[PDB]
């Protein structure tokens, strides 16, 4: 169950996903991205990401249709 | 149907369970209930070949869930404390494609073994818990170890 | 009065979800829709043991998109072909919107309903419906009568209906308050399962077909020079933690790349030596 | 012509819906239907069915019916539905091929010039044969034998595209799948693989069964082509191959020493690790 | 509103504006007569 | 994982501009750029610890 | 009739063998693959796809 | 009147090849079944008719249907390049009779044979068994060839209509004036 | 005649058996290889030819038994290492 | 729905259109319409969701040219 659940997460990171900005860290798990599509979201980090490259403004990709910080 | 399963429990009379068999047999959902319910109930503990070859035919043979829970409960109360005797029935609902009757084996080996202890029951519980694909026979394997478990009830949490 | 139950469920037959699910992707990004066959078994069972699809109309998806000459051509040929079964309902993909019913989507459904009080409305979206969840649903309504008098629109008798939570999307589009969502199950017997086994079943060969030697090769240096690097930086690591009370680690990834390594590396010795006994002149 | 023929995990469920529905009561054990999809010159893909009213008399295996109206019907339905399907081909149950599949391929042969058998299997799934599709081709047996029609037989995938895949995943996720290749799931395919090597062994040695004694006539292709594969073995002697010890150990190498010491450290160090954090909790408990 | 594209009756799609939206060719509703509609008024068009 | 992957699957929620709080149940805030809405607020958030001019998720 | 249209955009860089970003015109900016019968050996950054 | 799902077996064969009718014995054929399909539509309207051919193979060009025009263009260039074979021709009518659409309609063909049989008497009392036994009523002419209803056909009436059962008719048409109205003053009357 | 077991066939084989000079044995090689009826090569520093061809021939109903014998051995040759994988890792089959 | 079709494209003509949702689009086939016209700038009813040039509509302006009567 434990490989089938990482195969649900890595496939959560396939494509096509908008890109977007890292505007702030809100908790360990959440963060604000503001979409390219022209809108500001609050959303969740992926937990595999390194929080150490996520710095302001650095490029995200979010998920298509959940926005999340994939 | 309900009130003649549970007031005639045990007592394995032949003219209910044969007036509640036809109940069964009119092959109605709201009533397929509490017409298992009842076959369970009115030869409960028997081992009696006869209602467990029907039952189980008609769980095989009808399409309405209804029945099939009610079935279920009855086959699992048909063999009530019949300890090893039960193995074949248990076989024979484990290997089952429906899940309710794989649930129905669960409530069987919860019923044969109850309060016994068998190792082997509580194994046979545990792989089909861990194991079974459907979560209404893994939640009915579990729960069975109750049964099995409640005549030693220190040992029971560590499980 | 008699109230459907809330453990009354609709079971989606396999292939017709896999007809509903390659009918909404062909209409992307149009709207499509079909009638579904099957039998009401009871009061708390539906089920769909078949689906067609309906002729794209410029009208959408309406009552008047049924082509009722299309539909019954349809129904006796289907008859005919040995598929008897009465229309339990439709289907038309909300591409992208969720799953939930439109004002005309309800008035469709009233139109359906007036054929027969058990019939359902079931929507799929097909581009939320990626690899893994499938974004499916079935409504049936809620006749203003009982709302308005303060029933509520459907009795509970078990928890069957509860397992699963509404969405907040849905729930804004009217549902609990126009209609109701009814648990979806499918109805999947082991023959079917077996025969679509086949999609991902390799075959008897790539069991005893060997990787590439020199593909081999270069996959394991790769593999073992990350190794390398993994390794440092296990040290260095390590190093730190002696000077470090309880207060990405490189053992990790040392870890899974030991674990694809072990996998490959044996697979290939093993598989190359049972080429060499069973694949042999003799 | 088509080098390979794709069958979409629709088709496959449309005809196990068709056997069912007729088994009911149709005990005929072989059911024939028209099957469409997207036609290539390239690889062939079969994206969707409908079963028309067929019906087949045991006596002498050439009296049998084919309501060609309800084939042109349906497929006007299918084009109404979707116009980018065309007639492709055909399926039938009952694996063993009866007397009129060429009769029916040549009835079929008008709605569409390369009309192809596809035989869909329902029962046996053993190991390896979910399908067989199969084509007719204009030769009379051989270069110097009598008229014959002989089905051509065509590599046959079983792919699906995305959203009906995705439906495949759905009605799995059972205890099944695990896309990722475990060393477990890895030997048990290659027992898979040894079994159905046995299997095929089996079957050309019964065929060979039937043709030694006479019960079975020699087809000379199939004799040449066993001469051609016993012909094709390797050998393990030849002392150049055995040097493939070379490779074996060079594996051992990457096998042996760098990962299994790499993890047996990593476990040493995850022990030393709970040794002091349980001797560190006894000392924060005297 | 704007051009009446030359409707005749047989053409009684107009291209209409809505404000920062897109524009579009739409016809007429039954209630309504071409003759009270003609280019630069403001109208009232649903959404389906 | 398999929490996150649930959680995961729901959607975003849009930031926006508290305005002011309305009333102890509404709350005017503005969202860029679908506009200026008059939302509720939830079971877990109090309303006093929404002040003007902070940044809220709908 | 049975065809649907198409995004316009241009290719901004190429993340890995498949992964590319692009920018839709006048919209925003995505990761996307590419079909599976294609020149990749031409899709430069700044080609307009 | 009755409710029916006609099943002609049109004949194509070479033995067709004859000159019994005047300007064609295939074209008798072509022309008889399309009168014989006039006043078995004009006199159900909902009556279903179809077409089998049976030379060298029982193909089945149209079915039970209720169009004659189709039917009726299917007769032209029907190519009588073939070898007749009445046995398996009439046991596609059988089983196509079997597969009709609407289940009051009580089953019906109309078989038009102008070449020789060429066939053992006991297959064909043993079918006649077989179709007596499915209550298959079929209508038997016979056209060209001299052994105009022959000990074979004879025994296929009197069996069929075992004690004047179903009526299978033995309507004679005479090797030479096949003439419309030869073909309508028995059948349109009865049968 | 020879199953592979000394593929390397001297020069004074083909001599003797084709009735030939050792110098012609390799121009008739090279005409089998052009022709395209076999796919081997010549060895003449000790003068050998492998040889690996694909034409195959009748087969003399008796050969059938033979070559159903040799077919029969490779089987259960299979069949036995399937056993032994099998046996040696049940723990791991499942 | 109304666009400006930006330019017309070889392939056989293809056209990148902008529709007045300010959103560009490429159109493999070009709709249900004639092809040899069709200026670079004509204006043209495309369909509302698949996004096919289904009729042509005649020139609305060109700024001075209706600011000159
Ligand atoms: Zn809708």
New binding site residues.
Partial sequence: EFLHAQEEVKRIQSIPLVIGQFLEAVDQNTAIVGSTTGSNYYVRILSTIDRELLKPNASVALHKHSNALV | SLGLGLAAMGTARQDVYDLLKTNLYQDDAVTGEAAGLALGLVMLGSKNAQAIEDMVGYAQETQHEKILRGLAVGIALVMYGRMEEADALIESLCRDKDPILRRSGMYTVAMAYCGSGNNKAIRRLLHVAVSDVNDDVRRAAVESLGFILFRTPEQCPSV | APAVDTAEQVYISSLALLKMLKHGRAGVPM?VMGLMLGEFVDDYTVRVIDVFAMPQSGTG?SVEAVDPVFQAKMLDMLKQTGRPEMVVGWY?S?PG?GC???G??IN?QQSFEALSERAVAV?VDPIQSVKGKVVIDAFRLINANMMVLGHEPRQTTSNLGHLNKPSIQALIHGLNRHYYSITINYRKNELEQKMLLNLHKKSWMEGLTLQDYSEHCKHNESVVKEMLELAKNYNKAVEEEDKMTPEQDPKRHLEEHVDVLMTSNIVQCLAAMLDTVVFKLI | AVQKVVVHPLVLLSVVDHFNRIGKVGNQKRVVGVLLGSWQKKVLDVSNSFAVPFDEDDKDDSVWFLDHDYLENMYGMFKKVNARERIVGWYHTGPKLHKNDIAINELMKRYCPNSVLVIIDVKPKDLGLPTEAYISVEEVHDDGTPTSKTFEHVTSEIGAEEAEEVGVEHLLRDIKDTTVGTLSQRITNQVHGLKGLNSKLLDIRSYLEKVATGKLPINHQIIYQLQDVFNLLPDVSLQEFVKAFYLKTNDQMVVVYLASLIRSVVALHNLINNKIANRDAEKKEG | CTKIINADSEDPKYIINVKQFAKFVVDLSDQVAPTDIEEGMRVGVDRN | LREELQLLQEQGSYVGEVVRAMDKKKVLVKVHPEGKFVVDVDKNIDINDVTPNCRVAL | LQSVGQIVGEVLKQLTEEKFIVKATNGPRYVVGCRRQLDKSKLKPGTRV | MVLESTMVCVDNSEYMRNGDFLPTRLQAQQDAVNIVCHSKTRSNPENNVGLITLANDCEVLTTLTPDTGRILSKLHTVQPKGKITFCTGIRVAHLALKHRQGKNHKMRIIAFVGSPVEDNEKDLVKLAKRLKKEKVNVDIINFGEEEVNTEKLTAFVNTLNGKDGTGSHLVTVPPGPSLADALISSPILAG | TRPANHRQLTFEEIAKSAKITVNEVELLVMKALSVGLVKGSIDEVDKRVHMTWVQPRVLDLQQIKGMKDRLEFWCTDVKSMEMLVEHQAHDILT | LVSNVIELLDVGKCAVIKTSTRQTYFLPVIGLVDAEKLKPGDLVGVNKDSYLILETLPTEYDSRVKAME
Wanted: proline residues 0%; aromatic residues 16%; without cysteine.
């Fill in positions: 709207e998806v038309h909300h919107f939930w019913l439109s005309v989507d469709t929507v």
